Design a protein around this nucleic acid. Structure first.
Ligand SMILES: Nc1nc2c(ncn2[C@@H]2O[C@H](COP(=O)(O)OP(=O)(O)OP(=O)(O)O)[C@@H](O)[C@H]2O)c(=O)[nH]1
Ligand SMILES: [Mg+2]
Lengths: 324, 52, 34, 100, 141
RNA sequence: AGAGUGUAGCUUAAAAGCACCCAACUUACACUUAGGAGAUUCAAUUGACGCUCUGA
RNA sequence: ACCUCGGAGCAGAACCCAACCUCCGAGCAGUACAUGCUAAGACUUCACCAGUCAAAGCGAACCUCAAUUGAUCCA
């Protein structure tokens, strides 16, 4: 018996008797591209994915490109493969043009939306900038998905963003110790006048990151919301715990997210200090424990098995003597 | 045909291993891992074990 | 051995021939289709 | 020879179990499925076995497959049957060991 | 002490937690097919007729960090977007973006001719000098 | 005079992907690597600058 | 002539099964000298014997394909 296909069988549309007259895959790369396209395309059969799933600006760009091409030095450098690019200028231009979209993809990849807004997304329009002052001569930035140690995050960071009120908020998406879903707030400035941040209302004082030892890597998120009109709101974990989902549900009418910046924090002696000095509690230490190795049910007669069979099931390695 | 020969460690240990070489080919000298010394060392053909 | 200026001139020659023979093939194909 | 499939789809499989024994490549290794010297398909993880059809992209070093695929019409794409192990348990969990 | 109330089992929801700890799984199969899926992050380069593009993509298929010369911010600084200079510049930009995104380790899966390509060599040199290492650490079992 | 109207050769692409060409490897082709050129006809969805068809 | 082993007729599609018969082949060769040591879990010619694959780990680098074979005792 033969059940007919439930859809267009692959390679069926092009199945023709003019194979000789049909152009072929002269190269491996073109076939690779076609195969990737097919894999991306949905199918009616079981697949691996099922189981493991302005005009003036254009004119200006054209004119600038024409000028760059006309510049002979640029052409000479390109043909001599010695030219370079201004990384800082490229970074700034990308931030202005399409940085929000890439930051959105990073947030989706890190799961902030699924964990903060239960899947609801947005775009960080405002090119926010956060930096934790390390020492006095420098300040480590906090990009989207950066990596900063709690020692560097000990003190509150400097925030800069060219805009005009604002509410800034810091959460530890996975720093909670009792309830998996909840998270701890570290500092929250509200009703920020324009750019200056010292004038913000400190609803909750500043806490440094405190990721427990051997607890993995914790993602900390700076959220920034545009604020239409001010609203009155409201070292203890019970009060630092909350959910950004319902928190922002309570204020979405006048608050709208427009900035994001998140980083990764590990354990540190500053975490020890945070747990002891001010949290006033014994710090928890977590260890990654793998499940015990699987062994089949022990047989009375382990036929053809090596002598190690019995050791696989013995628990104590020291000699035992029973009644004697 | 080929012959089975006993390559013996040149590191002074009694370690040996059997290899195959053409009878007409010259005697064999070969780098091989020596478990006793825990290091790759030279081995030299000592005697023909058998003919195969 | 060679200098930098002759290399630049050679590259410009390759560019200009690319343009010229691109136009040649385009006009040949246009005549074909016509 | 007693070859063929040893674990059909939906069967729970422990790491190391042989999924299918074959002479030729009837079924190809998927995700978390390793291939022995004799083309035996074994589970590299503990989970459920799933059979799917996937586009076949041979390794460039495979001269015969590359020649076959370059001799192919511009629209055609090869498909092969693949075996995957959908891991069940997580790699592990973080447990409180001491309240220092 | 109420503050000491800690659940016996921690729950780190960061997608990159185990991946960064070097304990997460990698798809170790697919031995008969190319490219290998045994990675956490992959550097994929697409050299079109006009544009050269690079992606840092997770095993699940999510694109994590993309650098395309199609973008104005990058194409407004080089003569040709389909040459060795374009490849090197886009590689440097991708290295900077990967560092700012926290992606330090990567897997590159070029074809023999792609690897032999001088532009690919320049792109790999740019990435490694930018900091991204094109060789992921081994899993810890 | 009327109709269809309109992105470089093609695109139920939105300034992109395929196309296309030479330089080297090929007797040669092909592959690959290096490079190359390219368009949304002009004014405010609308009218008129260019093409195809229907007539004299 | 044959007695062991591999492949086809040959199970139309999991496995195994057509003996007798028609046949076609093997009793190796080539490479390498980590072709080292260990070890979860599995397959298995319908018994046993025997024969297969193998994660992880140590130590290193950064097998091949049809069969190609033989137990105990004893030297
Ligand atoms: N393993 C092994 N044992 C052998 C071999 N040849 C002989 N034997 C031993 O000796 C027995 C056969 O004896 P014989 O037939 O007399 O052997 P032979 O080598 O022809 O003659 P003798 O040396 O006079 O015994 C075997 O059953 C074994 O015990 C051999 O090639 N291998
Ligand atoms: Mg059996």
């Amino acid at each position: 018996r033969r059940t007919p296909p439930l859809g267009p069988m692959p390679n069926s549309d092009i199945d023709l008797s003019n194979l000789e007259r049909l152009e072929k895959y002269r190269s491996f790369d073109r076939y690779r591209r076609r195969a990737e396209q097919e894999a991306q395309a949905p199918h009616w059969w079981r697949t691996y994915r099922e189981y493991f799933g302005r005009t003036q600006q254009l004119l200006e760009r054209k004119q600038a490109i024409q000028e760059l091409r006309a510049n002979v030095e640029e052409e000479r450098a390109a043909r001599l493969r010695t030219a370079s690019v201004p990384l800082d200028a490229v970074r700034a231009e990308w931030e202005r043009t399409c940085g929000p979209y890439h930051k959105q993809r990073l947030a989706e990849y890190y799961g902030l939306y699924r964990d903060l807004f239960h899947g609801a997304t947005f775009v960080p329009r405002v090119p926010l900038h956060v930096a934790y002052a390390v020492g006095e001569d420098d300040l480590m930035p906090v990009y989207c998905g950066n990596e900063v140690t709690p020692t560097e995050a000990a003190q509150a960071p400097e925030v800069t963003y060219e805009a005009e009120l604002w509410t800034l908020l810091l959460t530890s998406l996975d720093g909670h110790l009792l309830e998996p879903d909840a998270e701890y707030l570290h500092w929250l400035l509200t009703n920020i006048p324009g750019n200056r941040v010292a004038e913000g209302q400190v609803t909750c004082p500043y806490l440094p990151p405190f990721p427990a030892r051997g607890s993995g890597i914790h993602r900390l998120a700076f959220l920034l919301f545009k604020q239409d009109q001010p609203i009155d709101f409201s070292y203890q974990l019970a009060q630092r715990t909350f959910r950004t989902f319902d928190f922002y549900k309570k204020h979405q009418e006048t608050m709208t997210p427009a900035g994001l910046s998140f980083f990764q924090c590990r354990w540190d002696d500053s975490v020890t200090y945070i747990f002891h000095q001010l949290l006033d509690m014994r710090e928890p230490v977590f260890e990654f424990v793998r499940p015990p190795p699987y062994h089949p049910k022990q047989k009375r007669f382990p036929h053809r098995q090596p002598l190690r069979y019995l050791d696989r099931y013995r628990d104590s390695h020291e000699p035992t003597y029973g009644i004697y | 045909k080929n012959i089975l020969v006993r390559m013996v460690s040149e590191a002074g240990t009694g370690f040996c291993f059997n290899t195959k070489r053409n009878r007409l080919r010259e005697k064999l000298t070969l780098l091989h891992y020596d478990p006793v010394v825990k290091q790759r060392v030279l081995f030299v053909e000592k005697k023909k074990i058998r003919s195969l | 051995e060679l200098t930098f200026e002759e290399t630049e001139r050679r590259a410009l020659l390759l560019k200009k021939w690319s343009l010229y023979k691109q136009q040649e093939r385009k006009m040949e194909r246009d005549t074909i289709r016509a | 020879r007693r070859q063929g499939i040893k674990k059909m789809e939906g069967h729970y499989v422990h790491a190391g179990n042989i999924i299918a024994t074959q002479r030729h490549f009837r079924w190809h290794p998927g995700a978390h499925v390793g291939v022995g010297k004799n083309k035996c398909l074994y589970a590299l993880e503990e989970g459920i076995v799933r059979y799917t059809k996937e586009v076949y992209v041979p390794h460039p070093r495979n001269t015969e497959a590359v020649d076959l695929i370059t001799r192919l019409p511009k629209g055609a794409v090869l498909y092969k049957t693949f075996v995957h192990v959908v891991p069940a348990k997580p790699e592990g969990t973080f447990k409180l060991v001491a309240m220092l | 002490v109420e503050n000491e109330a800690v659940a016996p089992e921690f729950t780190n929801r960061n997608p990159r937690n185990l991946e960064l700890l070097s304990v997460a799984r990698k798809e170790r199969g697919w031995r008969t097919v190319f490219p290998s899926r045994e990675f956490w992050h992959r550097l994929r380069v697409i050299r079109t007729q006009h544009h050269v593009e690079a992606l840092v993509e997770h095993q699940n298929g999510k694109v994590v960090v993309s650098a395309s010369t199609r973008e104005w911010a990058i194409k407004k600084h080089l003569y040709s977007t389909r040459n060795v200079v374009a490849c090197e510049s886009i590689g440097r930009v991708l290295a900077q973006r990967c560092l700012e995104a926290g992606i330090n380790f990567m897997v590159y899966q070029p074809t023999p001719w792609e690897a032999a390509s001088d532009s690919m060599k320049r792109l790999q040199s740019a990435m490694t000098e930018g900091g991204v290492v094109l060789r992921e650490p081994q899993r810890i079992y």
